[PDB]
Design a protein around this nucleic acid. Sequence first.
RNA 1: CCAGCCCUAGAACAGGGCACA
Lengths: 153, 240, 115, 307, 48
Amino acid sequence: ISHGRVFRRLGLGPESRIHLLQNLLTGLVRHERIEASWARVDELRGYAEKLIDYGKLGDTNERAMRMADFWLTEKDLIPKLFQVLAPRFQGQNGGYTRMLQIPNRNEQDRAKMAVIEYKGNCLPPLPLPRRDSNLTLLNQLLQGLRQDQEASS
Amino acid sequence: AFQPPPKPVIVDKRRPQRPETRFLSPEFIPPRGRTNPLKFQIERKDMLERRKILHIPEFYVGSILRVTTADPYASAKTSQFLGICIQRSGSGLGATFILRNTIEGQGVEICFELYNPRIQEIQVVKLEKRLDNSLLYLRDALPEYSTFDVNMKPITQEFNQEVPVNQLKVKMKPKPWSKRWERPKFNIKGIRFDLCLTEEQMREAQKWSQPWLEFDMMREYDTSKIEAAIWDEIEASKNS
Amino acid sequence: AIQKMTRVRVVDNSALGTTPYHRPPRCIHVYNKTGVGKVGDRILLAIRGQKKKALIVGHRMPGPRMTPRFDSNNVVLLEDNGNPVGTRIKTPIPSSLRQREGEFSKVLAIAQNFV
Amino acid sequence: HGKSVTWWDEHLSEENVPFVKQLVSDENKAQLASKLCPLKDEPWPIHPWEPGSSRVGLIALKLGMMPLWTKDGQKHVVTLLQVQDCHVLKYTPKENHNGRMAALTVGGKTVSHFHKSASILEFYQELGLPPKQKVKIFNVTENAVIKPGTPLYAAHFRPGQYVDVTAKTIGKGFQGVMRRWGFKGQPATHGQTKTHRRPGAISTGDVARVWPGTKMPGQLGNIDRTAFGLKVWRINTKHNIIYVNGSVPGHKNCLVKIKDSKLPAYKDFCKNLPFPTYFPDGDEEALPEDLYDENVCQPGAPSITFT
Amino acid sequence: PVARYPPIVASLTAKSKAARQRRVEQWQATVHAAKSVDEKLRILTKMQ
RNA sequence: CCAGCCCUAGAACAGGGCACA
Ligand SMILES: [Mg+2]
Ligand SMILES: [Mg+2]
Ligand SMILES: [Mg+2]
Ligand SMILES: [Mg+2]
Ligand SMILES: [Mg+2]
Ligand SMILES: [Mg+2]
Ligand SMILES: [Mg+2]
Ligand SMILES: [Mg+2]
Ligand SMILES: [Mg+2]
């Protein structure tokens, strides 16, 4: 019975899972886009969002400072977190990360793999799945319906 | 007959600047479950309607209270009990607090329900914070820290003392205790460990420390908007 | 919660409850259909090497709300006819015992403090 | 023809998704507002109450639990069941359903159109209502039948009554024999090897087989159970909430089928209750916000003291 | 009022070459803090 | 209708949700 559980078991225990997520968060802060297992990335996304919030909390905040000191293992990323990532996420509220499932690993384990990426990075944009255009048959029919509803008011 | 003059207040906001802070009782904070907020709204309306009749004051863990309960089998229909608040636990209409007092060498603990209609009057005789949010170690502490005068007079405090925190280290009975208060899961600062435990005992108790829980960032419960909405509802009910 | 082999503390002033002994007074048998006794339950004790009856006054296990919780498993010694052997009780007594006065009349008559 | 899988969002555009959402939302709002006055369009004939009559039930949502004190000092625990969207969907005649009593079908809270099948969507389109999540059948008498498509409210039950509550209990998955049947285990450490939770012997040597009624590990919980004789203490008419006594089977935020108590001690209690159902437009006078029982300590109380 | 950033030194218990160099600096600082010349020579030649 | 995503549903398969917000 695992009713109402939000964290999945990873690594060799709770502390090992924390350390794995910490390494993944350090790599994500450093490279602005990484790829790992789907479950590990899905677990790391929330920590990345909370880290961006703690970075937006400010530089002089001792709580945020010690949180960044714990999580970011490479100590050259804390100034980066506080002066690049947090300032560029100002008008946004919670849309800091983007996670997309990429094809399974070409290795023999065939692991379900995802890629996580901080929005607004200096990297080639991933092939995001774009919706259909309004010129499609069904979309044009729905546009006609919308125009009829607008004219009826 | 002559009556003496009252003593009015000489607050001067000019030289000292002092603002005012809000206090929300812990029973209004909803738990972390996925319950529908409509249940919390209903319970909050009920407990506000109850507080409209019964004045539930502000008191923290460590304060000394006196509760008057309706007892049918006593001489008088009321029964008073004075004791220190050991812990406050529960959410909504079922919030409870534990009062502890040593009466004739026998320590007695009573778990009172805040919103029980059998409670006539709750009186905080000493509004007082302590070094721990739950001082359940008073069972294993010396009795002098649990004896309180049942006929003690209420101590009136002014607003500008901001609930003085009592930094009182407590002596302890010999081992074993009701719980292992030396473990890091309790995080107790109100026990004088340096006189009852030893260095190797502290080192062995430090084996159960989990330093990652303070930096997990995912086990925290942010209730800023919830508390704001609760305060808005409280002000609306008070104005209604 | 007082069950078999539980060492209790005699509260009333009695020879058996005051005279020291090399073995504490343990509980022999609880007179409920369940093996656990609560406040106001007749019980059997082996005090000073002899069997005696007692009434559970207070225990350390938490019960219902607004009920007292004591720091010791307190018992008052009783006779076979239901009358207490002690003269008076100094320690406090739960006020809920006065609900059933038909069976605890002479026991409550010697109680001084009620909590 | 290797047709591929499709959903409602695959071929939609970035601009048509919100339009489709708002269109379905306004259609559902209009459909739910159209059925708000069932007693003036074409209501079925209301029959008088008879001693052998049975009433229809509701499908509510289990919100949570709350303490509730009675005027004698006792403290009970009540469960809050919120009747979100209860509508009578269809009616099957007595001879066509059971030959003894007719069957009224009742639907629960509203769900999305985009995740139901074609038959269910056709049925709900013909009825004129948005789809419901849980659909139950209630055995009613021929004189307590209601027209399909009528709404039902929590004021159907009155403060002070006994009800039956049916729901799927909290499923604990494939559980062992000790948690499923309450079997005792072997001692913990007195020599036992790899047996501390096994069922032990399962049958006898001469039978050379095990009996079908053998208690063995398996599924535990995800099954329908009924709690009988739960007392109703409070009815919140503003939010359509029922306060049933005790515990209700099933987790919170689940659909619960409530009906009148079929126990022999409460067989003729439906005399004073609204027989067909509670019609809020028939009285033309709004009920109080909260209907309490004659023993409940209401939140506004003089803080009762004994005399 | 002022930002207090932790130093940008490498890790101490890691497998990286920077961590190895930091441990080397640590034992060399132990040699520096050593008081007697006998202790200095012992710490300098205790590895064989 | 069941691609995917959640689940107080579950070993796998099954089962309930994904428009209000
Ligand atoms: Mg213990
Ligand atoms: Mg003998
Ligand atoms: Mg389950
Ligand atoms: Mg066992
Ligand atoms: Mg062996
Ligand atoms: Mg073993
Ligand atoms: Mg062996
Ligand atoms: Mg055979
Ligand atoms: Mg489904």
